[PDB]
C-alpha cells in the first residue's frame, strides 16, 4: 500500500539487501575468472566480486534508448517499426532479467577471452547462477519501484560507498604496505593516523606540485578538494519565480527549480553506455558473420603494439573512447588527448536534455502540476502569450549539462582525480541525491531518517 511512511521503511530494506549482497562474496570466492572489464565493473558495483550487479546504471539506458535515438534522428531513420511489446512494460522485466545472466554467459559464448568448452560443464551452474540471483532480486524491486514511487536512495548509497568506504578499506586492510599511503618503500608502519604523527615531526612531503607522480592515492585526495569546490558551485544556480502561492497577496511556498543540476544526470548515465563500445567493436571485427571488408575495416587497430598480441581493441577504438590518463595536460601524444575531448562534448550535450525532459521537465509537464497545488500563475501573461518557463527550459538545460560533461573529461588529463573521468562523475551523484533526499522528508531539518 502507498503511504510515505511505508516508503521510507521500504528504502531501509533496499539498503539492507545491498549490504547483504556485498557480505556473501566476502566469505567465499569462486575465482574462475571475474570477467567483466575491470574499470567498468568498478563503476557499476566496486565492492563484492563474483556477483556485482549487471542491470543497474547502464542496461537501464539500453531499454529506454529507442526513445532517444528515434527522436534525435528527426525522421526516425531506416529503422524497423519500433512499436512491439504489446503495449506497456513487462518487457522491461524481460530485458534486465536476461542481461544479468547474459553478461556472464556471453563472455565465454563469444570472444573476449575465456575458452568455453560449453558454458560450463561445472563452472557455470555454481558461478553463473550465483551472479544471476543478486541481479535478479534488484531488478524485480526496481520495476516495482517504477509504478508509484519516486523517493529512496538505495542506488545512490552504493555509489556513496564506492567513493568513501574504499578510502577506509584500503587504510584498515594491509600488512604488506599497500599502494595507499606511506610512500614508504617497504614495511615502515603504514596506517593513516600513524603517518600523520611521524610526518608532523619533520615535513609531510605534500605541499603540492606533481610529487614523485602517482605514488599513494592520498596525494590525489588532497587535490580532490579543488574539484569538489566547482561541483558544489554549480548546485547553487537557480532561477526562481514560484511566487504568490496559496492566496496571491505576497507570501508563498517555495519550489526549487533544479535548473542546470538535473541536466547533468543524463550525462552520468550516458558515460557508462559509451564505455561499453569496445566489446561490441571487437565482436564485429573477428567473431560476427562472414569476414566482410567493411566490418573489419571500420574497427581493427588490433594488429600491433603494447604486447597483448590479442590486442582487445585498445589499439585505437579505446583511444577515441578514452584518454591515455597521463598526469599533465595534452601529454606526449596530442592526438589521443584531442580526440577524446571532442568525442564526449557532443555526446554529453545531446544526452543532457533528454531523459529529464521526458520525465517531467518542460512547460507542458509543469502545467499539469500547477493546477493541483497553485503557484497562482505568478503575475504571468494571459494564455502565457510568449512563454517564460517554456522558452528558458531547453536553453538552460542543454548548457547545464555541457559544463559538467566538459569538466569530467578534461579532469582526467589533470592529475587531481585518482582514476580520471569516472571519479568526477561519481562525486557529482552524491551531492544531488543528498539534496533531493531532504526534500522528500521535508520535516524541517536535514537530520536523521535512518529508520525514521
Amino acid at each position: 500500500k502507498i503511504q510515505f511512511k511505508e516508503k521510507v521503511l521500504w528504502t531501509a530494506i533496499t539498503l539492507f539487501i545491498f549490504l547483504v549482497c556485498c557480505q556473501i562474496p566476502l566469505f567465499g570466492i569462486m575465482s574462475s575468472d571475474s570477467a567483466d572489464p575491470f574499470y567498468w565493473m568498478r563503476v557499476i558495483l566496486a565492492s563484492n566480486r563474483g556477483t556485482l550487479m549487471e542491470l543497474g546504471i547502464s542496461p537501464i539506458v539500453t531499454s529506454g534508448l529507442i526513445m532517444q535515438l528515434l527522436a534525435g534522428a528527426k525522421i526516425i531513420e531506416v529503422g524497423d517499426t519500433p512499436k512491439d511489446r504489446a503495449l506497456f512494460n513487462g518487457a522491461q522485466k524481460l530485458f534486465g532479467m536476461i542481461i544479468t545472466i547474459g553478461q556472464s554467459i556471453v563472455y565465454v559464448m563469444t570472444g573476449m577471452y575465456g575458452d568455453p568448452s560449453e558454458m560450463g560443464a561445472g563452472i557455470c551452474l555454481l558461478i553463473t547462477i550465483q551472479l544471476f540471483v543478486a541481479g535478479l532480486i534488484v531488478l524485480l524491486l526496481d520495476e516495482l519501484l517504477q509504478k508509484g514511487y519516486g523517493l529512496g536512495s538505495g542506488i545512490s548509497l552504493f555509489i556513496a560507498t564506492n567513493i568513501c568506504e574504499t578510502i577506509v578499506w584500503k587504510a584498515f586492510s594491509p600488512t604488506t604496505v599497500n599502494t595507499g599511503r606511506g610512500m614508504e618503500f617497504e614495511g615502515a608502519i603504514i596506517a593513516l593516523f600513524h603517518l600523520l604523527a611521524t610526518r608532523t615531526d619533520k615535513v609531510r612531503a605534500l605541499r603540492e606540485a606533481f610529487y614523485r607522480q602517482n605514488l599513494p592515492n592520498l596525494m590525489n585526495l588532497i587535490a580532490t578538494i579543488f574539484v569538489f569546490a566547482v561541483v558544489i558551485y554549480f548546485q547553487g544556480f537557480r532561477v526562481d519565480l514560484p511566487i504568490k502561492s496559496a492566496r496571491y497577496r505576497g507570501q508563498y511556498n517555495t519550489y526549487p527549480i533544479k535548473l542546470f543540476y538535473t541536466s547533468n544526470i543524463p550525462i552520468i548515465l550516458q558515460s557508462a553506455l559509451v564505455s561499453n563500445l569496445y566489446v561490441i567493436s571487437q565482436m564485429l571485427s573477428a567473431r560476427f558473420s562472414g569476414n566482410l571488408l567493411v566490418s573489419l575495416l571500420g574497427t581493427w587497430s588490433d594488429t600491433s603494439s603494447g604486447g597483448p598480441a590479442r590486442a582487445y581493441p585498445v589499439g585505437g577504438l579505446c583511444h577515441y573512447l578514452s584518454p591515455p590518463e597521463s598526469f599533465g595536460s595534452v601529454l606526449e601524444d596530442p592526438v589521443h588527448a584531442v580526440v577524446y575531448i571532442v568525442f564526449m562534448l557532443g555526446s554529453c550535450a545531446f544526452f543532457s536534455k533528454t531523459w529529464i525532459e521526458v520525465s517531467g521537465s518542460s512547460a507542458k509537464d509543469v502545467a499539469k502540476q500547477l493546477k493541483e497545488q497553485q503557484m497562482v500563475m505568478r503575475g504571468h501573461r494571459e494564455t502565457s502569450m510568449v512563454h517564460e518557463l517554456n522558452r528558458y527550459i531547453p536553453t538552460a538545460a542543454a548548457f547545464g549539462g555541457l559544463c559538467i560533461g566538459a569538466l569530467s573529461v578534461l579532469a582526467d588529463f589533470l592529475g587531481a582525480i585518482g582514476s580520471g573521468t569516472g571519479i568526477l562523475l561519481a562525486v557529482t551523484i552524491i551531492y544531488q541525491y543528498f539534496e533531493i533526499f531532504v526534500k522528500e522528508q521535508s520535516e524541517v531539518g536535514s537530520m536523521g531518517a535512518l529508520l525514521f
Binding site: 567465499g28 513487462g90 550465483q130 524485480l140
Partner: protein, 36 residues
Amino acid sequence: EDSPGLKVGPVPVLVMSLLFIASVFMLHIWGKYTRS
C-alpha cells in the same frame, strides 16, 4: 507480467535471498572456511 502475484514483502518472503547466503561459505576461505 508474471503469473505469481507477490512482489513486495514484509517478513519471510525473500526465500531466494535466504538460500543464496548459505551456499557461499563452502566455496572458499575468509574465516579459514573449507574450499569446495
